[PDB]
Structures are given as structure tokens and as C-alpha cells.
Ligand binder design. Structure first.
Ligand SMILES: Cc1[nH]ncc1-c1cc2c(s1)C(=O)N[C@]1(CC[C@](O)(c3ccc(F)cc3)CC1)N2
Ligand SMILES: Cc1[nH]ncc1-c1cc2c(s1)C(=O)N[C@]1(CC[C@](O)(c3ccc(F)cc3)CC1)N2
Lengths: 382, 387
């Protein structure tokens, strides 16, 4: 066949050897070889003279952080900040998440983003925040995503006293969004109001995929990797050395979310990491309520039990037909194209009134350290 | 102002960042990192576990040396042999030059082939031997060229007594071959009968481009190394070893002079028992150059040689290739300069089959595992070429 089998692999933007990735493999080789210490090497100097020229040019004609106006900083993650940005040429407003390369190399935390990228880029769901451009430089990783001007549910829940019928909507849109995540053979692990963003029209989209794992042939995962509030008992227990868990661990998170939304506090709240963790483990005795209807009370309890009997172990169908999700203005077939509880009031394309306000280098190597190598293949254009 | 600018750079076959070279980039990185000592590094291991699998599958599709049957070894250069090969699938015959990656690295001389490749892969001249494929593996560099069953001119000079009528032809063809090399912006520096091969029809081609330098924007080169074979070296290239060297194409016309002298006299002009003696005779070429009493040579032939074998300032061909063409020696009734290559050759080779190598005499170690990063395969990233 020759270069037909090989041409196909290059074309696929899902394959790790697409053109953009091959270019990363050159840049990160130049970026990690270009230090005077290592330059004493004959081989490393031959290479860098022949390529440094053309490599610098390439760097020029592909997406940079300079190609964006930074309207304002709207969030701050574990590694970098999330910015509200406007691309200069097209003038289109996006949300740009920065990830610090150095703060990732300085931690057992420099592979998480691969799932965060693949989901947001290729999920193609109405339930997933959508990635347009993924690019990098010597310092940072960048993801350019559709901006969600509606805020997150942590902001809504503090701003509005949430009544039962509002929770019927919000829980349901999480259920569906989660099912979409599951149908890509993935568990979210850490589902919570922070990863729940609202769009222009007040509808849900999941966002923070950092802690995602891909299910086994069976459907479980068997490896250890935050803060407990919304985390399932089996997941905490399994941090001490293996033991599988599955998709049902996300449904636990949902119950915690429905509780917090209806009551006001998380069901296992305590003013310490230890306290919430301890309460979760003894969930049999710790969960108690009030002013909640029996149908809503019941769904919370069907979620907040160990994985064996937890609602949604048998399927997403159990959840749907539950008496709590019975209303008038939406069916599961059209929930997204109905009116949301809170449709956000938006002045312009850069309005961020649903978000609040907020106000590093690599060490020059002696030997080859390969700091950029973990980030080869991250670059992506729509 | 678009990434369609970039799109062009990738597609351009003679661009440093074509897809083959980008894939070489990924490959020679996997090769220079996959060692247990190196893999103690988190980064290098994070990388290899994600790429090593797919990289292996690619290597599978890449042109192996297994793709060829080796008919006979027909030559051996400094850094490896030249095998007469038949490509298995196509069943076509090729000459394949091997270049040892180890011996090339071990001797600090590992940049000479880049020109050698471009000349053969892109010359498109009937005077330049032509490259079809250029692949590599961890151990070797490979050059698949069109086979030249006729043999080299060193062979022709020791099987036949060359009369001046033949010398006229061969010298003329060498002259035109070099003009084609020059018109591509390159000086050869190593013109010799060994680098002069003969096609199926007994006609010339130039072969060993390892020593080639590309002229600057003014047709001159700055070289401070005395490069090439000691017998054919020009006084300027020789002197250039010490201090600022400065020369153009003229040095190639020196070689042509020596070539002709060898062909008519039967010996090189500045021959000596040592290398160090040959150099000295070249330096004192006014006094050392003389034709023997017994060798009979036309007054035209001696004129052409001596016009070639002088200081660059007064050397023939300094004022264009034209003053060579019209030289009285090149007067004949058998070929013009327009056609020469389509006249009958003085020696047409008798080939019995497509693997006949009767015009070639028959004949008849790797890297250590590194501690840290060494990048042994880095000088070879981008070698790979296909037609
Ligand atoms: C706004 C937008 N529009 N289109 C995409 C986005 C994203 C926003 C974030 C995204 S995308 C993300 O990936 N991470 C975070 C990092 C900050 C976070 O941890 C936070 C903030 C405040 C809290 F009170 C608690 C938590 C939430 C997740 N933010
Ligand atoms: C035959 C063919 N067909 N298509 C390409 C070729 C090439 C052949 C060679 C090529 S291409 C080459 O690059 N190098 C050499 C290595 C051996 C050499 O140095 C030599 C020196 C003195 C000798 F008495 C004999 C041989 C000559 C050049 N051979």
C-alpha cells in the first residue's frame, strides 16, 4: 500500500501522530535541547543549528496567547486561571483556561488534561463545554472553550432560594449530562456545582473533566488518584489501595447535589477534611434532614447508599422514571429546549456578573530533563 | 496570514519540516530515550509509554533493508558498502549505498551526506546519478540509486589504453557534468575517476558528492578544511587548511586537469610515495609538474592540461565554462557539445543481464547503551526520502 496506511494515521485528529502532534514532537525537542550545558554535545548542537531556524518561524505562525485580549479573570484552577478572552482578529469571545506546565511537572499531576481535552474537543454533546482550540508555549497549556455566561450552580444556589420544581430541572439536566459522559465510556469521579456551568439560556453543561477515568472492558476502574464533600464512599475507601468502582459513583455525587440544592448545606458537611470524610463513611447514620416532599426525600436516599443498591446501578432508566422527575413543562426528550428556572440577564457578550473577582519559571537544566515531553500532542485546532 | 502558509512548508518535499522528517523526528527521539537508565526519568517514561507503541507500528511500514535482495557487494566507501540490490516487490535493480551511523558519529564526521542526498534526489540531470529512495534504521543510513553497470573510470583506465580520441570524449562529459553540478550552486571538490560512473550505454555520471559545498550568494566558499582525495587536490583547497580559505568553482577544473593527465600519461601528476609528499608536489606545482620524455602527448592535450593545472587566478575556466568548450583539444568529428550524450560511447559495456556486475571487482560494530541522553540519531533526523 505504502503511504496510504500512513497517510490515514496522519489525517486522524484523534491519532497521536497527527501533523500538529508531530510538530509538538519537534518543538518540545528543541525547547528541551536548547540549553548551553547540553549544547556542548555534538549531536544536540548539529540538530539545533539545522532546525532552530525553521522551528522559530513555525512558532510564529501558530496560535499564541497574544492572539487574545484578556477581558477579565473569571476563575482560578489548581494550576492556572480561567480567563474571559476575546480573540483579536475574529473578535469572538471565548473562555480560556490556562494550565501551568511547571506546577504540573512539580507533581504526580501531568496527565489529567488528556481526558479534559478529548472530552471537550470530541464529545460533541450539548451537555459538554466545547473546546475550539488547544495550544501551548514553553510556560503554559491553553484550552479555548465556549464561554458560559450563566455562571455555575454554586453561584445560583447561593443567589436563589431553590424550590423543589427548580431542583427537578437541575438534577435531571445533570443526570442527562452525566449519562452522556458515561456513554463515552467515562466516569467523571468528581461531579459538583463547580463543574456544572449554565449557558446563555440558563441550561446545564459539565466542565471540569480533570479527574476523569476511562472504564474497563467490564466498566470499572482499578487505579488510585481531591476533597470529599461530593465524593462516593467506595471512591474514598479505594484511595488506600485499589478496589474497583464504576459509573454508579457519579450518581452518588448527584444525590449530594440534590440534597445541597434542596436543603442548603451538603449532607455530610463538617468544618474539617477529616469530619466530612468520617461522616461520608458512616453515611448510614450521618445522613438526616426540613420541608422536603416524600418523592424528593426518596431520590436522595436511593442515591446515598453503597454502590450495590444505589439507584442507577441497573441503568439510567431507573433514574428517569422516578416519581420526583414528574412535572408538566419538560420531558426527557426536550428538557434543553424548554425554559430554565433562571435565564441569565446578559448585557453584552463580555458580561460576567454571574462570576466574581480575583487578583513562575522552569530551572535551566544541566542534563536532559525533558520537561516539555509530557505535553507533546496537546495542540489542537477545531 | 493563515496556517495555510504552514500547510505548504509541510508538503514541500525539499523542506526541513516535511512529513517524513517530522516522523523521523518522533522516531529518533523514541530511539534515543528508550534505555532503562534514561527511563528512570518521569518525563521520558511518560512520553515513551504513550508513543512507543504507535511509533513501532509506523517503523513497520517504513522501507526496511529487508525489502531488498542483496545480489553482490560492488564497492565499499569510508562509512560502509555499496550493494547491488533487487527490490523484492518491484523486482527492479538498484545500487544501494550504506552509511554506518556508528562510524559516522564515532568520527565526528556526520553532516556530509545532506548535500549528497539533495544532489541525487533533486538534480534531475543526466549527468548526476539519481536517488529513488533514502531510508534509515537505528544502525544504518541507506541510499537507493540507479545502478551503473558500466563501472567506474578507474576500471576503464586499467583495462584499456586510452587514446586521445577517448580522452576528448570523457573529459568533455566530465566538463559538462561539472557545469551541471555548478549550475545547481555547488562545487564538487572530489572529482576523480572513482566518482565517474558509466551507465548502460557507456556514458558518464558523477557519483560521490560527500565533499560538496554549496556556493554563497557570490559563487564563493569559505572553508578552512583541506577536503578531498590527496592526488586530485587543488593548491587553493590545500592551502585553505591554514587560515581563511576563499575559493569558487575553479578548484573543480583543477581536478579535471589531473584526471586528463592520469588518462594520457598513465600516472597522476603529483604522485609521491607518501601523502605528505604528494601535498608538497602540489604546493610546488610550477616546478614539480612535468611530462615524461617517453609518453607521447599531442601539443593540444598538453596545452589543455597545463591551462587547467595553474594558479586559480590564471586557470582555464575561471572566466566561464565557455573557454573550455572551444579549446582546440576538443575539436572532433564524432560529437558536438549539444548532443555528446547521444553519440556512441568509446566503450559500450557488454551486459549479459540486469544484475551483471563484471565491471566491478568483488570484495570480502555498534553504539554503547547510554547513561543519560546522547542523541545519536539526532544528526540523521530528516534523511528519509521517497520518490
Ligand atoms: C466559565 C467558563 N465558561 N466556559 C468554560 C468555563 C470554565 C470554567 C472553569 C473551567 S471551564 C474549568 O475547567 N475549571 C474551573 C476552575 C475554577 C473552579 O475550580 C472553581 C471556581 C469557583 C469556585 F467557587 C469553585 C471552583 C471551577 C472549574 N473553571
Ligand atoms: C556503482 C553505482 N551505481 N549507482 C551508484 C553507484 C555508486 C558507487 C559508489 C557510490 S554511488 C559512492 O557514493 N561511493 C563509492 C564508494 C567506493 C569508491 O570510493 C571507490 C573508490 C576507488 C575504487 F577503486 C573503487 C571504488 C567510489 C565511490 N561507490
Amino acid at each position: 500500500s505504502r503511504q496510504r496506511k500512513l497517510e490515514a494515521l496522519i489525517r486522524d485528529p484523534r491519532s497521536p501522530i497527527n501533523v500538529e502532534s508531530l510538530l509538538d514532537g519537534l518543538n518540545s525537542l528543541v525547547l528541551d535541547l536548547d540549553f548551553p550545558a547540553l549544547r556542548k554535545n555534538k549531536n544536540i548542537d548539529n540538530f539545533l543549528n539545522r532546525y532552530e531556524k525553521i522551528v522559530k518561524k513555525i512558532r510564529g505562525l501558530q496560535m499564541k496567547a497574544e492572539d487574545y485580549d484578556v477581558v477579565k479573570v473569571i476563575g482560578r484552577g489548581a494550576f492556572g486561571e480561567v480567563q474571559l478572552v476575546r480573540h483579536k482578529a475574529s473578535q469572538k469571545v471565548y473562555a480560556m483556561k490556562l494550565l501551568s506546565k511547571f506546577e504540573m511537572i512539580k507533581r504526580s499531576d501531568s496527565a489529567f488534561f488528556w481526558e479534559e481535552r478529548d472530552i471537550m474537543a470530541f464529545a460533541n454533546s450539548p451537555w459538554v463545554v466545547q473546546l475550539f482550540y488547544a495550544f501551548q508555549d514553553d510556560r503554559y497549556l491553553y484550552m479555548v472553550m465556549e464561554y458560559m455566561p450563566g455562571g455555575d450552580l454554586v453561584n445560583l444556589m447561593s443567589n436563589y432560594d431553590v424550590p423543589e420544581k427548580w431542583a427537578k430541572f437541575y438534577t435531571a439536566e445533570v443526570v442527562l449530562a452525566l449519562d452522556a459522559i458515561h456513554s463515552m465510556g467515562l466516569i467523571h469521579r468528581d461531579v459538583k456545582p463547580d463543574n456544572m456551568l449554565l449557558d446563555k439560556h440558563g441550561h446545564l453543561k459539565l466542565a471540569d473533566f480533570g479527574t476523569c477515568m476511562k472504564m474497563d472492558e467490564t466498566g470499572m476502574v482499578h487505579c488510585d488518584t481531591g476533597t470529599p464533600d461530593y465524593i462516593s464512599p467506595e471512591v474514598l475507601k479505594s484511595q488506600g489501595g485499589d478496589g474497583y468502582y464504576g459509573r454508579e459513583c457519579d450518581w452518588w455525587s448527584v444525590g449530594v447535589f440534590l440534597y445541597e440544592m434542596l436543603v442548603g448545606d451538603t449532607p455530610f458537611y463538617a468544618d474539617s477534611l477529616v469530619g466530612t470524610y468520617s461522616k461520608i463513611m458512616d453515611h448510614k447514620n450521618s445522613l438526616c434532614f426540613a420541608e422536603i416532599s416524600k418523592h424528593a426525600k426518596n431520590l436522595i436516599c436511593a442515591f446515598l447508599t453503597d454502590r450495590e443498591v444505589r439507584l442507577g446501578r441497573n441503568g439510567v432508566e431507573e433514574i428517569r422514571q422516578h416519581p420526583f422527575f414528574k412535572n408538566d413543562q419538560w420531558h426527557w426528550d426536550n428538557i434543553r429546549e424548554t425554559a430554565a428556572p433562571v435565564v441569565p440577564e446578559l448585557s453584552s457578550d463580555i458580561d460576567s456578573s454571574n462570576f466574581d473577582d480575583i487578583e513562575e519559571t522552569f530551572p535551566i537544566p544541566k542534563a536532559f530533563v525533558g520537561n516539555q515531553l509530557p505535553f507533546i500532542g496537546f495542540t489542537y485546532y477545531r
